[PDB]
Amino acid sequence: GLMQFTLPVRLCKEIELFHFDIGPFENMWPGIFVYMVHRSCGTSCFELEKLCRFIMSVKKNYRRVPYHNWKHAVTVAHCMYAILQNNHTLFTDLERKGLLIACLCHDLDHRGFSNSYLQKFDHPLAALYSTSTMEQHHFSQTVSILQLEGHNIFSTLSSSEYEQVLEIIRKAIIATDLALYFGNRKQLEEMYQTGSLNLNNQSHRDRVIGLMMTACDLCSVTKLWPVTKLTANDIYAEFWAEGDEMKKLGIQPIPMMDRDKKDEVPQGQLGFYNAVAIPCYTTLTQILPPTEPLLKACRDNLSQWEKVIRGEE
Ligand SMILES: Cn1ncc(C(=O)N2CCC2)c1C(=O)N[C@@H]1CCn2cc(-c3ccccc3)nc2C1
Ligand SMILES: [Mg+2]
Ligand SMILES: [Zn+2]
Numbered sequence: 001g002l003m004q005f006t007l008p009v010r011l012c013k014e015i016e017l018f019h020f021d022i023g024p025f026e027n028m029w030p031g032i033f034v035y036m037v038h039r040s041c042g043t044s045c046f047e048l049e050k051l052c053r054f055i056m057s058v059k060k061n062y063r064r065v066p067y068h069n070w071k072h073a074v075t076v077a078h079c080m081y082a083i084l085q086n087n088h089t090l091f092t093d094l095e096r097k098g099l100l101i102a103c104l105c106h107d108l109d110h111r112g113f114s115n116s117y118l119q120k121f122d123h124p125l126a127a128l129y130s131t132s133t134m135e136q137h138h139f140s141q142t143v144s145i146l147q148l149e150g151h152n153i154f155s156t157l158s159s160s161e162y163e164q165v166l167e168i169i170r171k172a173i174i175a176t177d178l179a180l181y182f183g184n185r186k187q188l189e190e191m192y193q194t195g196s197l198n199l200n201n202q203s204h205r206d207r208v209i210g211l212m213m214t215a216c217d218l219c220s221v222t223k224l225w226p227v228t229k230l231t232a233n234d235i236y237a238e239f240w241a242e243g244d245e246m247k248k249l250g251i252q253p254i255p256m257m258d259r260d261k262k263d264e265v266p267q268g269q270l271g272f273y274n275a276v277a278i279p280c281y282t283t284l285t286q287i288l289p290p291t292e293p294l295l296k297a298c299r300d301n302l303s304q305w306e307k308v309i310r311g312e313e
Contacts, residue, residue: 001043002044003048004038004043005034005035005038005217005267006032006176007031007032007035007229011023011032015032015035015036015078015081016082016085017078017082017168017293018082018219018222018291018293018297019222019224019227019293019297020082021077021223021224021243022071022074022078026070026071026275029059029070029074030055030056030059031053032074032078033055033074033077033100033104034048034051034052036077036078036081036100036271037051037100039081039085040081040084040085040096040100041093041096041097041100042260045096045097045219046058046097046158047153047155048107048206049150050150050152050153050155051153053148053150053151054145054146054151054153055104057145057148058073058104058105058108058145059196061108061109061141061145062107062108062109062110062273063109063110063111063112065110065111065112065236065238066112066234066236066237066238066241067112067231067234067235067237068107068110068111072227073103073104073105073106073107073108074104075219076103076104076106076107076216076217076219077100077103077104077216078219079103079215079216079219079222079294080099080102080103080115080212080216081100082098083215083288083291084096084099084100085214086288086290086291087288087290087291090175090199090288094164094165094168095168095209096162097154097165097167097218098165098168098169098172098211098227099212099308101142101153101169102142102169102172102173102213103166103213103216104175105138105141105142105145105169106135106138106172106176106213106217107134107138107176108137108138108141108142108145108172108181109137109138109141110134112238112241112242113134113238113242113245114134114242115131115132115133115134115135115177115179117245117246118133118134119133120246120249120251121245121249125137131177131179132174132177132179132180135173135174135176135177136174138173138176139169139170139173139174142169143166144258146166154166154275167205168209169211171206171209172209172210172213173213175209175210175211175214176213176214176217178214178276180208180210181211181214181276181280184207184210184211184214185211185214185279185280185283186254188207188208188287189229189283191204191207192283192287197287198206206279208255208287211280211283211284212284213286214280215280215281215284215291215294218277218280219294220232220235220295221273221277221297221298221301222281222294222297222298222301223297223301225300225304227300228304229304232265232269236259236262236265239256240257240258240259242257243257243259244259245257255268256268266308266309267307267309269305269308270302270305270306270309273301273302273305275297277298277302278295278298278299278302281294281295281298282295285287289292
């Protein structure tokens with residue numbers, strides 16, 4: 001009822017901004033998440049005791065991998081929170097419940113390997129799920145945790161609202177498969193430009209939410225440059241581990257995953273800001289003007305990678 005979460009002043013202020021970094025104090029991340037559910041949804045969205053137990057079961061099922069870890073999940077939920085808070089009146093009650101949860105859960109039980117590696121390794125999960133292999137697993141792990149005893153944070157919904165929210169979560173996690181992003185963004189681009197984009201059209205809303213998921217998932221690129229840089233190192237730590245495993249399967253990895261080709265990182269960053277990041281936040285800005293700060297920050301980081309390449313760092 002009356003038991004607000006409250007954050008220190010610097011955090012209380014800076015958490016509202018897109019570029020906020022959640023800090024190195026793991027013990028504070030659960031409290032940050034709850035704070036954001038309470039402001040984004042209401043103190044009355046979730047039974048606190050259930051929410052707390054869900055969060056701690058979610059955290060327990062992230063692994064100790066350089067990038068795809070509990071910090072990443074909480075980072076991705078904070079970017080979603082800042083989008084929701086900036087676009088108050090665009091989303092439903094169900095959407096605001098579903099999407100923070102979806103984001104906290106979107107990489108559950110990730111091992112640091114790509115859908116590619118699972119498929120080339122011939123991992124069991126590539127037999128159960130032949131595309132978006134990991135993302136189908138991350139959805140499946142979310143349903144498992146929701147069905148633990150005392151873990152149904154959705155217990156007050158009806159049969160159909162519950163089914164709607166779980167359907168919001170499932171699409172939202174699947175959309176974090178970057179292979180799906182390109183086609184999603186192009187259709188949104190064609191729709192927005194021709195004026196056919198329609199936010200009572202559920203198939204259009206799904207597209208838009210998928211684009212939000214990509215934006216939150218990649219939100220590394222929208223931080224202050226030192227966060228961006230030190231995050232990049234965790235990303236590459238995983239990719240080069242996967243490359244070492246590709247070499248052990250007797251397969252020359254893609255350069256992105258080859259630690260011997262570290263020199264070309266700056267160039268690959270530009271490619272990715274140009275081919276993925278910037279177009280994502282550009283299209284996001286057009287559909288939701290108040291997310292422009294993500295585009296601006298992303299552009300500032302593109303310029304940092306250019307400086308790296310001109311040897312000015
Ligand atoms: C920042 N960010 N955030 C999430 C992701 C991301 O793609 N994923 C999947 C899991 C997260 C990234 C990222 O930067 N991805 C780039 C993709 C293409 N590319 C090519 C090279 C590259 C090419 C030749 C030599 C050296 C390096 N480096 C990259 C990194
Ligand atoms: Mg993922
Ligand atoms: Zn992710």
